[PDB]
Short mmCIF file of C-alpha atoms and ligand atoms in Angstrom, two decimals:
data_model
loop_
_atom_site.label_atom_id
_atom_site.label_comp_id
_atom_site.label_asym_id
_atom_site.label_seq_id
_atom_site.Cartn_x
_atom_site.Cartn_y
_atom_site.Cartn_z
CA UNK X 130 122.02 123.16 39.07
CA UNK X 131 121.03 119.81 40.58
CA UNK X 132 119.58 120.19 44.12
CA UNK X 133 120.24 116.65 45.42
CA UNK X 134 123.95 116.94 44.55
CA UNK X 135 124.24 120.23 46.41
CA UNK X 136 122.68 118.48 49.41
CA UNK X 137 124.93 115.41 49.26
CA UNK X 138 128.09 117.46 48.69
CA UNK X 139 127.37 119.83 51.60
CA UNK X 140 126.40 117.13 54.10
CA UNK X 141 129.34 114.90 53.16
CA UNK X 142 131.56 117.77 54.37
CA UNK X 143 129.67 118.08 57.66
CA UNK X 144 129.93 114.31 58.10
CA UNK X 145 133.71 114.49 57.77
CA UNK X 146 133.73 117.17 60.45
CA UNK X 147 131.61 115.25 63.00
CA UNK X 148 133.47 112.01 62.21
CA UNK X 149 136.73 113.78 63.12
CA UNK X 150 138.27 113.51 66.63
CA UNK X 151 137.58 117.14 67.60
CA UNK X 152 134.53 118.43 65.70
CA UNK X 153 133.96 122.14 65.26
CA UNK X 154 130.80 122.75 63.26
CA UNK X 155 130.59 126.34 61.97
CA UNK X 156 127.12 127.87 62.21
CA UNK X 157 127.63 129.30 58.71
CA UNK X 158 128.49 126.00 57.02
CA UNK X 159 125.84 124.13 59.01
CA UNK X 160 122.98 126.58 58.43
CA UNK X 161 123.80 126.88 54.72
CA UNK X 162 123.62 123.10 54.29
CA UNK X 163 120.27 122.96 56.08
CA UNK X 164 118.78 125.59 53.75
CA UNK X 165 119.55 123.29 50.82
CA UNK X 166 117.02 120.85 52.27
CA UNK X 167 114.16 123.38 52.48
CA UNK X 168 113.05 123.06 48.81
CA UNK X 169 112.33 119.35 49.47
CA UNK X 170 109.29 120.12 51.63
CA UNK X 171 107.82 122.38 48.95
CA UNK X 172 108.22 119.59 46.40
CA UNK X 173 106.16 117.21 48.54
CA UNK X 174 103.36 119.78 48.53
CA UNK X 175 100.65 121.12 50.83
CA UNK X 176 101.01 118.26 53.38
CA UNK X 177 104.43 119.59 54.39
CA UNK X 178 103.53 123.28 54.59
CA UNK X 179 104.13 123.00 58.35
CA UNK X 180 107.83 122.91 57.49
CA UNK X 181 107.76 126.63 56.72
CA UNK X 182 107.29 127.41 60.41
CA UNK X 183 108.78 124.20 61.85
CA UNK X 184 111.92 124.15 59.68
CA UNK X 185 112.48 127.08 57.30
CA UNK X 186 112.02 129.76 59.98
CA UNK X 187 114.27 127.72 62.24
CA UNK X 188 117.01 127.61 59.60
CA UNK X 189 116.54 131.34 58.85
CA UNK X 190 117.29 132.08 62.52
CA UNK X 191 120.52 130.06 62.48
CA UNK X 192 121.60 131.88 59.31
CA UNK X 193 121.16 135.15 61.22
CA UNK X 194 123.17 133.90 64.20
CA UNK X 195 125.93 132.61 61.91
CA UNK X 196 127.21 136.17 61.42
CA UNK X 197 128.09 136.58 65.11
CA UNK X 198 128.54 133.05 66.47
CA UNK X 199 131.39 130.69 65.56
CA UNK X 200 130.18 127.13 66.19
CA UNK X 201 127.15 125.12 67.33
CA UNK X 202 128.91 124.36 70.61
CA UNK X 203 129.56 128.05 71.27
CA UNK X 204 125.99 128.85 70.24
CA UNK X 205 124.51 126.43 72.76
CA UNK X 206 126.92 127.49 75.52
CA UNK X 207 125.59 131.06 75.24
CA UNK X 208 121.99 129.91 75.75
CA UNK X 209 123.00 127.66 78.65
CA UNK X 210 124.84 130.60 80.21
CA UNK X 211 121.89 132.96 79.69
CA UNK X 212 119.48 130.24 80.88
CA UNK X 213 117.38 130.62 77.73
CA UNK X 214 117.68 127.13 76.23
CA UNK X 215 113.96 126.37 75.96
CA UNK X 216 112.95 129.98 75.34
CA UNK X 217 110.83 130.56 72.24
CA UNK X 218 113.06 131.84 69.45
CA UNK X 219 116.32 130.82 71.11
CA UNK X 220 119.05 129.47 68.84
CA UNK X 221 119.31 126.22 70.80
CA UNK X 222 115.57 125.57 70.60
CA UNK X 223 115.64 126.32 66.87
CA UNK X 224 118.65 124.03 66.46
CA UNK X 225 116.63 121.18 67.96
CA UNK X 226 113.82 121.78 65.46
CA UNK X 227 116.31 121.90 62.58
CA UNK X 228 117.61 118.53 63.75
CA UNK X 229 114.13 117.02 63.43
CA UNK X 230 113.75 118.28 59.87
CA UNK X 231 117.07 116.73 58.90
CA UNK X 232 115.93 113.50 60.54
CA UNK X 233 112.61 113.45 58.68
CA UNK X 234 114.39 113.81 55.34
CA UNK X 235 116.79 111.01 56.30
CA UNK X 236 113.83 108.71 57.05
CA UNK X 237 112.06 109.96 53.91
CA UNK X 238 115.05 109.11 51.73
CA UNK X 239 115.50 105.69 53.38
CA UNK X 240 111.88 104.83 52.63
CA UNK X 241 112.03 106.13 49.06
CA UNK X 242 115.11 103.98 48.43
CA UNK X 243 113.36 100.96 50.00
CA UNK X 244 110.15 101.42 48.01
CA UNK X 245 111.80 101.52 44.57
CA UNK X 246 109.49 100.09 41.91
CA UNK X 247 106.54 101.81 43.61
CA UNK X 248 105.48 105.05 41.94
CA UNK X 249 103.57 106.21 45.04
CA UNK X 250 105.23 108.36 47.72
CA UNK X 251 102.40 107.75 50.22
CA UNK X 252 104.27 105.30 52.48
CA UNK X 253 107.63 107.13 52.58
CA UNK X 254 105.91 110.46 53.27
CA UNK X 255 103.46 109.03 55.81
CA UNK X 256 106.09 107.00 57.67
CA UNK X 257 108.67 109.80 57.79
CA UNK X 258 106.08 112.25 59.11
CA UNK X 259 104.65 109.82 61.68
CA UNK X 260 108.07 109.04 63.11
CA UNK X 261 109.53 112.53 63.39
CA UNK X 262 106.83 115.23 63.39
CA UNK X 263 103.49 113.66 64.38
CA UNK X 264 104.37 113.35 68.08
CA UNK X 265 104.99 117.13 68.12
CA UNK X 266 101.79 118.18 66.35
CA UNK X 267 98.26 118.72 67.64
CA UNK X 268 95.15 117.13 66.14
CA UNK X 269 94.40 119.86 63.57
CA UNK X 270 97.88 119.77 62.01
CA UNK X 271 98.00 115.97 61.88
CA UNK X 272 94.60 115.92 60.14
CA UNK X 273 95.65 118.66 57.70
CA UNK X 274 98.88 116.77 56.92
CA UNK X 275 96.95 113.52 56.39
CA UNK X 276 94.60 115.27 53.95
CA UNK X 277 97.56 116.80 52.13
CA UNK X 278 99.00 113.33 51.53
CA UNK X 279 96.44 112.99 48.70
CA UNK X 280 98.21 115.87 46.95
CA UNK X 281 101.64 114.24 46.95
CA UNK X 282 103.46 114.20 43.61
CA UNK X 283 104.18 110.79 42.04
CA UNK X 284 107.66 109.37 42.71
CA UNK X 285 108.56 109.89 39.05
CA UNK X 286 107.28 113.47 39.26
CA UNK X 287 109.36 114.24 42.37
CA UNK X 288 112.50 112.91 40.69
CA UNK X 289 111.71 115.11 37.70
CA UNK X 290 111.51 118.18 39.97
CA UNK X 291 114.86 117.21 41.51
CA UNK X 292 116.32 116.62 38.02
CA UNK X 293 117.54 113.05 38.46
CA UNK X 294 116.77 109.58 37.17
CA UNK X 295 116.26 106.65 39.57
CA UNK X 296 119.94 105.62 39.57
CA UNK X 297 121.40 109.07 40.24
CA UNK X 298 118.73 109.95 42.80
CA UNK X 299 119.44 106.73 44.66
CA UNK X 300 123.14 107.58 44.91
CA UNK X 301 122.75 111.12 46.27
CA UNK X 302 119.80 110.31 48.53
CA UNK X 303 121.81 107.41 50.00
CA UNK X 304 124.77 109.79 50.30
CA UNK X 305 122.65 112.15 52.40
CA UNK X 306 121.49 109.24 54.57
CA UNK X 307 125.13 108.20 55.14
CA UNK X 308 126.13 111.79 55.97
CA UNK X 309 123.17 112.86 58.10
CA UNK X 310 123.19 109.77 60.32
CA UNK X 311 126.31 110.75 62.27
CA UNK X 312 125.39 114.46 62.05
CA UNK X 313 122.02 113.81 63.69
CA UNK X 314 123.79 111.73 66.35
CA UNK X 315 126.27 114.56 66.96
CA UNK X 316 123.44 117.10 67.29
CA UNK X 317 121.49 114.88 69.70
CA UNK X 318 124.54 114.43 71.91
CA UNK X 319 125.08 118.20 72.20
CA UNK X 320 121.77 118.22 74.05
CA UNK X 321 121.96 114.89 75.89
CA UNK X 322 125.47 115.39 77.25
CA UNK X 323 124.19 118.49 79.05
CA UNK X 324 120.95 116.78 80.15
CA UNK X 325 118.99 119.29 78.06
CA UNK X 326 116.68 116.65 76.60
CA UNK X 327 115.58 116.41 72.95
CA UNK X 328 111.80 115.91 73.06
CA UNK X 329 110.68 119.49 73.78
C1 SPU Y 873 91.47 128.03 51.72
C2 SPU Y 873 92.01 127.67 53.11
C3 SPU Y 873 93.49 127.25 53.00
C4 SPU Y 873 94.05 126.90 54.43
C5 SPU Y 873 95.57 126.86 54.39
C6 SPU Y 873 96.11 126.26 55.69
C7 SPU Y 873 97.12 125.16 55.37
C8 SPU Y 873 98.51 125.57 55.89
C9 SPU Y 873 98.57 125.37 57.44
C10 SPU Y 873 100.07 125.36 57.91
C11 SPU Y 873 100.23 124.38 59.11
C12 SPU Y 873 100.52 125.20 60.41
C13 SPU Y 873 102.02 125.48 60.53
C14 SPU Y 873 102.41 125.59 62.01
C15 SPU Y 873 103.56 125.00 62.46
C16 SPU Y 873 103.99 125.09 63.94
O1 SPU Y 873 103.39 126.21 64.52
C17 SPU Y 873 103.54 123.84 64.67
N1 SPU Y 873 104.23 123.75 65.90
C18 SPU Y 873 102.03 123.90 64.93
O2 SPU Y 873 101.58 122.63 65.52
P1 SPU Y 873 101.05 122.60 67.04
O3 SPU Y 873 100.67 121.18 67.30
O4 SPU Y 873 99.94 123.54 67.28
O5 SPU Y 873 102.30 122.89 67.95
C19 SPU Y 873 102.29 122.52 69.36
C20 SPU Y 873 102.01 123.79 70.22
N2 SPU Y 873 101.13 123.46 71.35
C21 SPU Y 873 101.75 122.47 72.17
C22 SPU Y 873 100.89 124.65 72.14
C23 SPU Y 873 99.90 122.96 70.86
C1 SPU Y 874 93.00 123.83 57.13
C2 SPU Y 874 93.26 123.42 58.62
C3 SPU Y 874 94.72 123.81 59.03
C4 SPU Y 874 94.78 124.05 60.56
C5 SPU Y 874 96.16 124.68 60.94
C6 SPU Y 874 95.97 125.66 62.12
C7 SPU Y 874 97.26 125.70 62.95
C8 SPU Y 874 97.22 125.49 64.30
C9 SPU Y 874 98.48 125.51 65.16
O1 SPU Y 874 99.41 126.38 64.59
C10 SPU Y 874 98.14 125.99 66.56
N1 SPU Y 874 99.32 126.14 67.32
C11 SPU Y 874 97.41 127.34 66.48
O2 SPU Y 874 98.40 128.43 66.48
P1 SPU Y 874 97.96 129.91 66.96
O3 SPU Y 874 98.98 130.83 66.39
O4 SPU Y 874 97.84 130.02 68.42
O5 SPU Y 874 96.62 130.22 66.20
C12 SPU Y 874 95.89 131.45 66.48
C13 SPU Y 874 94.38 131.24 66.20
N2 SPU Y 874 93.76 132.48 65.71
C14 SPU Y 874 94.36 132.85 64.47
C15 SPU Y 874 92.37 132.27 65.51
C16 SPU Y 874 93.95 133.54 66.68
#
């Protein structure tokens, strides 16, 4: 199968949901779509190993919760009720981390699309990391990530891993960008509308 098309197809559906008048985002559909993004960090290599703990484990948790909890709204309401929003391992806290991962990939794709004709992924990877994850990482991690940037695959190599040529990759990557933009906005507002904040 072709991994970018599974991503675009799944997030298009979520986009339709959050673009609708009364959105109800199922934890099952949401968490499944997010797990389709996980292979991307492995492709980029050792620099993004932090995503195992900062993203993959966070998605794993939401997949667990999806068996007993209907929607993202219901999921957050439980944590608000139990006063465990910022508690380590809480579904709401993990949801916030998942949001950041989705955001980083959105920025990554945007920069890859912009830097077409350049076979180096250095700028897209460095800029996406610096914007989304760097403010949440201590010195050691940021240095390790910076070092790992030397081990990035070439742009052409990445596309080969994803099984697309330039033209087809541009379409599905842009499709994710178009879909994740309102999804990320919807997720942010779930926090902000309850004054929960989004920078913790
Ligand atoms: C041969 C040798 C190979 C050596 C292999 C080692 C390379 C892989 C290292 C993986 C990176 C660590 C993954 C951790 C991710 C999360 O825990 C992050 N939150 C950690 O960042 P931190 O800045 O400490 O989080 C903030 C927490 N704090 C505020 C309390 C600092
Ligand atoms: C190669 C250099 C990679 C450095 C990555 C080390 C990761 C640091 C962050 O995860 C910090 N939050 C440290 O996490 P913590 O779990 O408290 O580390 C425990 C340290 N200890 C193993 C020595 C006990």
